[PDB]
């Protein structure tokens, strides 16, 4: 029960998948604008 705390609290921090989802989308966007 000791360190059963923080890893789901790091799964809280998977908004970087969402913010960097927008950044990955944007990479595709302007990358293919360039292409």
């Amino acid at each position: 029960y000791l360190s059963k705390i923080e890893e789901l609290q790091l799964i809280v921090n998977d908004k970087s998948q969402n913010l960097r989802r927008l950044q990955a989308q944007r990479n595709e966007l302007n990358a293919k604008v360039r292409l």
Partner: protein, 472 residues
């Protein structure tokens, strides 16, 4: 028997998207909040507050809560057939006889989907199971075999705090569902515990309940429990208001967007009742412009009867007739006449309105109004006339405003300098003010000094738009 199909339908539409829907939105979801059926279910809570909830009467007694509380099981995919068991029991209200199995038989019913099986892992099914049956019961407080069951049903919701802080071996983020419920129902807690008396150990329930939402789930708890604490200390006397003065941690993401509004109204009443004009009236202003809609009558009207009282104490106040609901008109009959007594400089009227409606001023209960309202009369007069004339005499304003002597007028000028309205001196022999207005004061750099805050404020809002662009 033709109307109860409507709670039969909307009930199943609630626990469909909520139970199966938000449980499916809770299994692995919600990087921040993918459980849109949390907020959808709260919109159905508002629907149950607009409508009758489910079975307060509904032409029968006690139909849905003995019915739907059973048989979820969370098993092999023939548990949609358990939803078919939920649906096909509706020939009991339609064809059969309805029977009384609420408020007395709910006490094992709440154990029943837990006693079907070890049903499922996530606690929003349990808080759904002790909220969505029991929250239809909290709004019938006729104080006769119905408030003790609000009492006990919210002891089961105390067992939802117990099954909130001690669930998922710590930190699955279902508070972002359950505090979404444990906002609303906890207010109902402080409703029903204050339907009879002041609560004193529910103060402590609230205290440790604030402490569990400290850091591991600082999401929707701290602000709503902060409202319960604020209205606790507000309904009670003024002793614990130095708390925010030392523990000012009152700043969430302000998600609910009405919680932040009426919350900032409430601490507006706090700083108002301490002593404050400017900050108090500008969060009266800010909470006033954050008043959501006109979708609830009266709740802005009476709260706005209480909103502009510090502006009644400014002396610079207009009369709220476009705010005036005509249903509020019969209740602002003292209050229209109160601000009538404000702008009139009469004294017999000043004590005549207080004399006439001191009982409604007790319903106000904010008699710091009257201790400084005569003071507000003399500040409005000196603000108007001091604003008017550059070199007036104190004998001019004095024996017009019935001051009868020069020396207390010199005390008015003295404490007006001390309060800093005008730079009025005295041609010091016996009074007889020599003074000035103040124009040619400055007008050019001083505005573009303010434009640092206008446009630094604008770039604040700019980065609010960039972070607003961070959403999709």
């Amino acid at each position: 028997p033709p109307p109860p199909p409507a709670p039969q339908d909307v009930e199943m539409k609630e626990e469909a998207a909520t139970g199966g829907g938000s449980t499916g939105e809770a299994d692995g979801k919600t990087a921040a909040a993918a459980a849109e059926h949390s907020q959808r279910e709260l919109d159905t809570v508002t629907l149950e507050d607009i409508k009758e909830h489910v079975k307060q009467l509904e032409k029968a007694v006690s139909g849905k809560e003995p019915r739907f509380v059973l048989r979820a099981l969370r098993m092999l995919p023939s548990t949609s057939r358990r939803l078919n068991h939920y649906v096909l029991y509706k020939a009991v209200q339609g064809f059969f006889t309805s029977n009384n199995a609420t408020r007395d038989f709910l006490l094992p019913f709440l154990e029943e989907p837990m006693d079907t099986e070890a049903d499922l892992q996530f606690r929003p099914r349990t808080g759904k199971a002790a909220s969505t049956p029991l929250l239809p019961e909290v709004e019938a407080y006729l104080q006769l075999l119905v408030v003790i069951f609000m009492m006990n049903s919210k002891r089961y919701k105390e067992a939802q705090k117990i099954s909130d802080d001690l669930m998922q071996k710590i930190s699955t983020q279902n508070r972002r569902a359950l505090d979404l419920v444990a906002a609303k129902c906890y207010y109902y807690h402080a409703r029903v515990y204050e339907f009879l008396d002041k609560l004193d150990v529910v103060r402590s329930f609230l205290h440790a309940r604030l402490r569990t939402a400290t850091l591991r789930h600082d999401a929707d708890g701290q602000a709503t429990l902060l409202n319960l604490l604020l209205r606790n200390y507000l309904h009670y006397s003024l002793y614990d208001q130095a708390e925010k003065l030392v523990s000012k941690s009152v700043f969430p993401e302000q998600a609910n967007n009405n919680e932040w509004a009426r919350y900032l109204y409430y601490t507006g009443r706090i700083k108002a009742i301490q002593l404050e004009y400017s900050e108090a009236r500008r969060t009266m202003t800010n909470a006033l412009r954050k008043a959501p809609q006109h979708t609830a009558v009266g709740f802005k009207q009476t709260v706005h009867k209480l909103l502009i009282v510090v502006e009644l104490l400014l002396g610079e106040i207009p009369d709220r007739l476009q705010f005036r609901q005509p249903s509020l008109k019969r209740s602002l009959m003292p209050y229209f006449l109160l601000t009538q007594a404000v702008r009139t400089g009469n004294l017999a009227k000043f004590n005549q309105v207080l004399d006439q409606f001191g009982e409604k001023f007790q319903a106000d209960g904010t008699y710091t109004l009257i201790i400084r309202l005569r003071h507000n009369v003399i500040k409005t007069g000196v603000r108007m006339i001091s604003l008017s004339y550059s070199r007036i005499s104190l004998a001019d304003i004095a024996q017009k405003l019935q001051l009868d002597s020069p020396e207390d007028a010199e005390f008015i000028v003295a404490k007006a300098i001390r309060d800093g309205v005008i730079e009025a001196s005295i041609n010091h022999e016996k009074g007889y003010v020599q003074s000035k207005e103040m124009i040619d004061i400055y007008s050019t750099r001083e505005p573009q000094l303010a434009f640092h805050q206008r446009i630094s404020f604008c770039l604040d809002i700019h980065n609010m738009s960039v972070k607003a662009m961070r959403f999709p």
